[PDB]
């Protein structure tokens, strides 16, 4: 069985990953007074499969670049994204990593290597700058990203994502800790290099440094990775802060509710992209080492004291 | 093992895709300012590592101590950050 | 005070930032519950309570813990 | 190590073969170490040049080792005196002379003879009088 | 040698019921049968060796089996319903099943006369006077060395003074 | 140590945790706790020069609880020769090695 | 330096040795060593001259690898004895590592190459701290573990240092490096008696500190890093010529002055312990150290080197005075010998 | 067991590295770190199989001090390729 | 597979071998990353979780990340193949040495408390806040000073 | 709400910890009983494995003390099936 449970939890996500690009190229469209892709297939449903096949068929250009690293970075990217979905605590999570959140944090950090190495391997000036810019923003947003989680955990009692289903049986962790949700949402927008924070492949400012030289199959794999992440991080928002209803008798309700909230917050970063111009590099980092990091540090204290002075220490189960 | 099984499928799925990609289509910066930020990162990362143990410290019978200790950790590092600002190091 | 005001309206994060820093440095000191944390966590029975030799003159819980003598957590109950 | 020590076990002036062999090794060992420091610092120009210097120092040192061993042992047999420190001095005397030659300098042979021989003689006395070097703390 | 006890010495009837069964009756077993257990604990602690409390362990087991035989005889059905629901949960959490727990608890109070121990009152340390001899010299402690002797007396100005090279001092 | 500002001040910031038998968190004794005690209550009042010869039984044992090398050795021998007995078909694991058992 | 930073650093450079000395848990002794390494590096590059960056980058790599080796010894011990501290039972190789490592941080013998070079590129002031308040820490660790270390190695590092220090000094003309070389030598005597009578190490150090601290504040009074520079002392400030003369001969072992006592009692203790081989050779080349000390004497005092007209200008202006410490540490050093019995 | 001899030799192989520069300061600062990892792994390993929980603080104190140690090391490195345009050690030969 | 542990140790050794060969600073950083990964694996193998994570979120995290960053800046110029060759040379020699003792996972998890409820890695290190309160004060001072040391050394 | 919920959650936690507190006595006996069996069973095979070996005390405490030193995991399952040993060794790290 366990193998079947690996197909499910993977394929299903990959098929959904494909349908996100479509729901991105249509929701951005209707917001901009245009139908979006509806001519290939019925209502554009076959559109994601179509360019996948074009991308893989087109020549994988190997610039005259460190081959090993050039090819590895894509592999790492996809590997990490698909891996980060293993311990997610949808009911009866695939793998009850006791320290799951730490695992999520860890793999999320490793991704940075891909962009960095890709730029270095590409050997193009645009790519180099992209990597440097990317690593800096990525790691920095990791520093507030991690502290925001530590505040959460201390009110959950453990690192296991499964505990929050029992922590959020009466109220979402948004009510409490909303100030961090916002700061988790903005950090989730940075770490998936989505729009407001997409200086990694600004295209206009610098031309897609990450994949300047990447085309065809390598382009696709990161590509796939980004979008799967886009979902995963949104899904982590939908477990950590927006806690879906859960009933031991009926475990499905959780998944269904998890679906609805994940799709809406996934819809939100699509909506954010069309709605906002892109932050500058300096502006981006300032916001995090300056506008947020002081906010995130202080609340950490408040969340350390809160349990004690409220004698609300959580069970360690 | 269960994790090992999942992960190797994960790498296999990727490596399969890159290969298909290649096999199917047969037919000097001066980031000094950054440098500084990077170092602070290293430092802050380490603090965070010293703040990670809290989830179990919250359980310490010596709750007060934990509070004082923890509060100090965050506060002291906060000061370090502020200094960066005061000395205008980061700016 | 005046700067405080503008600070509340300009650079209104630090203000909030510090305010919290303090409020977390105060609530613990004044709280009808602060004491409970060290108790509630103290009480949790993680390790087995090894028995004691009933040598004599023992005011401890008399054998069956259901006996009246001994510590109680009714404070935890109805808390 | 049981080896080097053997030099001392058999009475001096006897079994010169083993004496000379042992003495030659010690010199050679010192040669290697000495060349090593000489190559690590004050490096050479080409690997070969340095391999040569190792050889030069090793052989020179091995030679001083041999003649010391040979002269002292033989001086003993001939003189029919096995514990006369002078034996060693003659040996050290010779050893210095080899060094002098390998450095192509009569003067060095002078200092070499006196200084080196004296040192060796003192070794003999040291052994004869049971002098202790690098002693354990016994306060 | 090792003086490992023989099998016949360590063969005794076994409880062998699913852990779930125990957790459901845990509270009551902590109630009806802690006399012998506490004593066994005392032995196993002060006397470090296990061989030194094996027999007590046999007594430990005997006390529970009948505990079960009583419940099997009376209010078996309630208990059966309570454990089955308790077992389904992955961490066999007690709160998912409270309706089944109430009927199981009320009945045995009604028939067996036992009582579910109120929150706590099981964690509290117990006093059991094991008639076994409180052991000594455990860990075959053996022997200790003699403290260096003590120089005794009172100080008197040093003799002839600092005796350093030519210093009348 | 060189300057005992700790004993003098009475503080114990560095002594409470220097050996395995010291207080363990949540009173969970560490391994080997049965010997180090026996090997330091022995060498207490007797200086080292004489904690090194007569209190050698307790270190030779504590050197074996921790390292646990003599055991490794004995067992390894048992393994090797058992291989030789199996080699001579003399021995093969019984159901003792593989069988059902008490809780 | 923002005076706040100056405080944090200086506190660390001072908390560094003090934690080492006070603690018994070796680990805490290691971090005391680590804090000293971190605190000293900022001060070393204060001028930020091209020579300085070289100095610090060497000092740091030499200090860092030695620090890692000391930690490895503590980590290994932890497995050979659960204790976090060296004991009678400690494997001999475990202790020898600590000797080599600690002899690198202190810079003794075949690891004496970093010190002369870092002493050359750092200011005279930070030179003193790098020579004397950074030797206290490692030596403390050794003195604590003396009962266990090897008599053979120490002696070899001791003798080597004496020789290297002496020979190196003979050629040097830069003062900073003459002192660096002397320190290597004195450091050698200190480590020679450690296995036998640690209490004398603490005398051969204090006296070295009470001798070197006045000597350096003398070199900087006129900030002369050259002998030629110190030779014109007679014009810049004539009085210090008298005591500079005695302190340098005191640094070497000449008998009336305080400097003889450390060598005399170390020789007495080594002969008491029977090293009359080792002690003799050490004392003999110790005499080489005085030769280069007296060569400086010649240039600075006994003979008057020619000076520059522009010097008359520096005379006119009032000379900023030497701190009081100079005097109190010059006299207690040049002449306390009549009070030796109590000192030991 | 043997696990420890591999880690120990790893530290010696890292030792041989830091003591034999190859024209790259960065690489060295990177080797130096290889030790700290080996020390951290060995300290954690024995603490874990001695069940000595009172000592786990150390495995981390080792890393915290080692990180800053490295921070200082890299700032010196950046200082060097600001004064000489390279991290190459040969450049560091002015103090002769 | 009892050999699991030995296998890991070997990988770690090999990785440190590469770092020892001192390849391009970036190659070195990569190698260490692999070793650090091996390291957390081994620690976890014994049972320590929090401990294993740390090296990951610290070494496999920024520790090499900044190195990486750093190198980009100060390491510009790319025999690595020859280095790779020597690496294989070392590998076989390494293997040869183990084969030496070959002619001449038995005991891990040496001792365990089968029933236990508050034993787990991290709890012990959590005692930095209680009964080990001098480790973390000195570490905090280390960081608070290091801020200042780096800001002037860069200044 | 969070304050009240965790206070309730804490009450449930103390309840089930105490539930084992009550049940461990039954398990402790069980463990020891079974543990000894494994040691003894290994004794039988022990008394049949190195019998031929000269100078072979069937078994003897690696130590001198007669104190009861608990059996390492290896000792208990070392001679036994590989899987058995592996299970114990790598059987928790690998979840259910
Ligand atoms: C255990 C741990 C031990 C750690 C040891 C660490 C040592 C570190 C030394 C400092 C670092 C290395 C260094 O500075 O390099 C100096 C030096 C640099 O050499 P170089 O500049 O490359 O040589 C170029 C020319 O060949 C140089 O010209 P040349 O060699 O043609 O002429 C010089 C020659 C000229 O000879 C003389 O005129 C003087 C002769 C004096 C004789 C005294 C005899 C005393 C006998 C006592 C017994 O001097 C000698 O040969 C003296 C020979 C003495 C022989 C004594 C008996 C052996 O390196 C060495 O000389 C050897 C260093 C290692 C010495 C190891 C121990 C000594 C035994 C082996 C020799
Ligand atoms: C083995 C030992 C060997 C010892 C000798 C060798 C070692 C020392 C060598 C010293 C010289 C080495 C060469 C240095 C460079 C010489 C050429 C140079 O450039 O000098 C320029 C340099 C220019 O300085 P200046 O501006 O003319 O200074 C005026 C002087 O201070 C003069 O000022 P003033 O004369 O206008 O003022 C009068 C004052 C002059 O004051 C001083 O200068 C004192 C200097 C003390 C130096 C101690 C050095 C040791 O008189 C007093 O000393 C105080 C008298 C009233 C208080 C008496 C207290 C009770 C004494 C009881 C008897 C004490 C002895 C027995 C012990 C007690 C009974 C058991 O010439 C000097 O001043 C040399 C000063 C040091 C003379 C030391 C003589 C020590 C004789 C023993
Ligand atoms: C404003 O115009 C633009 C858009 O359209 C509105 C975009 O959405 C975007 C976003 C990206 C694009 C250029 C187009 C989106 C890409 C796709 C249609 C899918 C990409 C394909 C892949 C990497 C793999 C697809 C295949 C699979 C998932 C197969 C899985 C089994 C940009 C940047 C843009 O310029
Ligand atoms: C490619 C690199 C990224 C690979 C994907 C990300 C891997 C992240 C692994 C994090 C560490 C594993 C972990 O945290 O949990 C493993 C889990 C034990 O955790 P715990 O909840 O305590 O379970 C015990 C109680 N039931 O149970 C286990 O211990 C399972 C066994 C350990 C598995 C660790 C991960 C294995 C990764 C295999 C691929 C490695 C590829 C390396 C490539 C570089 C070259 C070698
Ligand atoms: C008392 C106990 C302790 C608790 C105390 C609580 C006090 C009240 C709460 C205070 C803080 C509330 C807000 C927290 C998040 C915002 C933090 C912040 O300060 O914003 C920084 C930045 C705006 O900064 P800027 O305009 O540049 O000016 C800075 C002036 N100092 O922000 C930005 O620029 C963000 C840019 C975002 C671009 C994309 C925007 C997307 C908007 C739609 C999504 C919003 C988030 C949705 C989250 C859903 C749930 C996860
Ligand atoms: C960079 C960062 C630098 C940080 C520097 C921190 C320096 C101190 C670090 C350790 C501080 C330990 C404080 C212990 C306080 C305590 O135990 O409280 C009990 C008692 C009174 O406190 P209480 O009545 O509980 O009031 C609290 C109300 N919330 O308090 C007391 O009466 C005193 C209790 C002393 C407990 C033993 C302390 C021994 C030494 C600990 C290490 C510090 C050594 C000096 C530095």
Curated annotation (Swiss-Prot), chain A:
Gene: Mtnd1
Membrane topology according to the record: Multi-pass membrane protein
First and last residue of the signal peptide: none
Assembly information from the UniProt record: Core subunit of respiratory chain NADH dehydrogenase (Complex I) which is composed of 45 different subunits.
Subcellular location: Mitochondrion inner membrane
Enzyme class of the recorded protein, top EC level: translocase
Keywords, in A-Z order: Electron transport, Membrane, Mitochondrion, Mitochondrion inner membrane, NAD, Respiratory chain, Translocase, Transmembrane, Transmembrane helix, Transport, Ubiquinone
Record EC number: 7.1.1.2
Job of this protein: Core subunit of the mitochondrial membrane respiratory chain NADH dehydrogenase (Complex I) which catalyzes electron transfer from NADH through the respiratory chain, using ubiquinone as an electron acceptor. Essential for the catalytic activity and assembly of complex I.
GO molecular function: NADH dehydrogenase (ubiquinone) activity
A Pfam family it matches: NADHdh
Annotated transmembrane regions: 2-22, 69-89, 99-119, 135-155, 170-190, 230-250, 252-272, 292-312
Name under which the protein is recorded: NADH-ubiquinone oxidoreductase chain 1
Origin superkingdom: Eukaryota
From Swiss-Prot, chain B:
GO molecular function: NADH dehydrogenase (ubiquinone) activity
Superkingdom: Eukaryota
Primary gene name: mt-Nd3
Sequence intervals crossing the membrane: 3-23, 34-54, 65-85
Pfam families: Oxidored_q4
Membrane topology, record value: Multi-pass membrane protein
Record's keyword annotation contains Transmembrane helix: yes
Keywords: Electron transport, Membrane, Mitochondrion, Mitochondrion inner membrane, NAD, Respiratory chain, Translocase, Transmembrane, Transmembrane helix, Transport, Ubiquinone
Enzyme class per UniProt: translocase
GO CC entries: mitochondrial inner membrane; mitochondrion; respiratory chain complex I
UniProt keyword Transmembrane helix, yes or no: yes
BP-aspect Gene Ontology terms: aerobic respiration; cellular response to glucocorticoid stimulus; mitochondrial electron transport, NADH to ubiquinone; proton motive force-driven mitochondrial ATP synthesis; response to light intensity; response to oxidative stress
Family: Belongs to the complex I subunit 3 family.
InterPro entries: NADH_UbQ/plastoQ_OxRdtase_su3, NDAH_ubi_oxred_su3_sf
Protein name in the entry: NADH-ubiquinone oxidoreductase chain 3
Functional summary from the UniProt entry: Core subunit of the mitochondrial membrane respiratory chain NADH dehydrogenase (Complex I) which catalyzes electron transfer from NADH through the respiratory chain, using ubiquinone as an electron acceptor. Essential for the catalytic activity of complex I.
Coiled-coil regions listed: none
EC number, UniProt record: 7.1.1.2
Substrates-to-products reaction catalysed: a ubiquinone + NADH + 5 H(+)(in) = a ubiquinol + NAD(+) + 4 H(+)(out)
Localization annotation: Mitochondrion inner membrane
Swiss-Prot record, chain E:
GO CC terms, sorted: mitochondrial inner membrane; mitochondrial intermembrane space; mitochondrion; respiratory chain complex I
InterPro entries: CHCH, NDUFA8
Complexes and interactors: Complex I is composed of 45 different subunits.
The protein's name in its UniProt record: NADH dehydrogenase [ubiquinone] 1 alpha subcomplex subunit 8
Gene that encodes the chain: Ndufa8
Biological role stated in the UniProt entry: Accessory subunit of the mitochondrial membrane respiratory chain NADH dehydrogenase (Complex I), that is believed not to be involved in catalysis. Complex I functions in the transfer of electrons from NADH to the respiratory chain. The immediate electron acceptor for the enzyme is believed to be ubiquinone.
Ranges spanned by the short sequence motif Cx9C motif 1, renumbered to the chain: 33-43
Location (main, coarse): mitochondrion
Membrane topology of this protein: Peripheral membrane protein
One MF annotation (Gene Ontology) recorded for this entry: protein-containing complex binding
Motif, Cx9C motif 2: chain positions: 53-63
Short sequence motif Cx9C motif 3: positions: 75-85
GO BP annotation list: aerobic respiration; mitochondrial electron transport, NADH to ubiquinone; proton motive force-driven mitochondrial ATP synthesis
Domain of life the protein comes from: Eukaryota
UniProt domain comment: Contains four C-X9-C motifs that are predicted to form a helix-coil-helix structure, permitting the formation of intramolecular disulfide bonds.
Keyword field: Disulfide bond, Electron transport, Membrane, Mitochondrion, Mitochondrion inner membrane, Repeat, Respiratory chain, Transport
Entry's localization field: Mitochondrion inner membrane; Mitochondrion intermembrane space; Mitochondrion
Sequence motif Cx9C motif 4, residues: 97-107
Domain CHCH, first and last residues per copy: 30-71, 72-115
Family statement drawn from the similarity comment of this UniProt entry: Belongs to the complex I NDUFA8 subunit family.
Disulphide linkage map: 33-63, 43-53, 75-107, 85-97
Swiss-Prot record, chain F:
Coiled coil region boundaries: none
Bias (Basic and acidic residues) ranges: 78-90
Superkingdom per UniProt: Eukaryota
CC annotations in GO: mitochondrial inner membrane; mitochondrial intermembrane space; mitochondrion; respiratory chain complex I
Keywords, sorted A to Z: Disulfide bond, Electron transport, Membrane, Mitochondrion, Mitochondrion inner membrane, Respiratory chain, Transport
Chain positions covered by the region annotation Disordered: 78-103
Cited CDD domains: NDUFS5-like
Record flagged with keyword S-adenosyl-L-methionine: no
Chain location of the short sequence motif Cx9C motif 1 per the record: 32-42
Motif (Cx9C motif 2): 55-65
Membrane topology note: Peripheral membrane protein
GO biological process, one term: aerobic respiration
Intracellular or extracellular location(s): Mitochondrion inner membrane; Mitochondrion intermembrane space
Keyword match ATP-binding: no
Functional description taken from the UniProt entry: Accessory subunit of the mitochondrial membrane respiratory chain NADH dehydrogenase (Complex I), that is believed not to be involved in catalysis. Complex I functions in the transfer of electrons from NADH to the respiratory chain. The immediate electron acceptor for the enzyme is believed to be ubiquinone.
Family: Belongs to the complex I NDUFS5 subunit family.
Domain statement: Contains two C-X9-C motifs that are predicted to form a helix-coil-helix structure, permitting the formation of intramolecular disulfide bonds.
Protein's UniProt name: NADH dehydrogenase [ubiquinone] iron-sulfur protein 5
Organism: Mus musculus
The encoding gene: Ndufs5
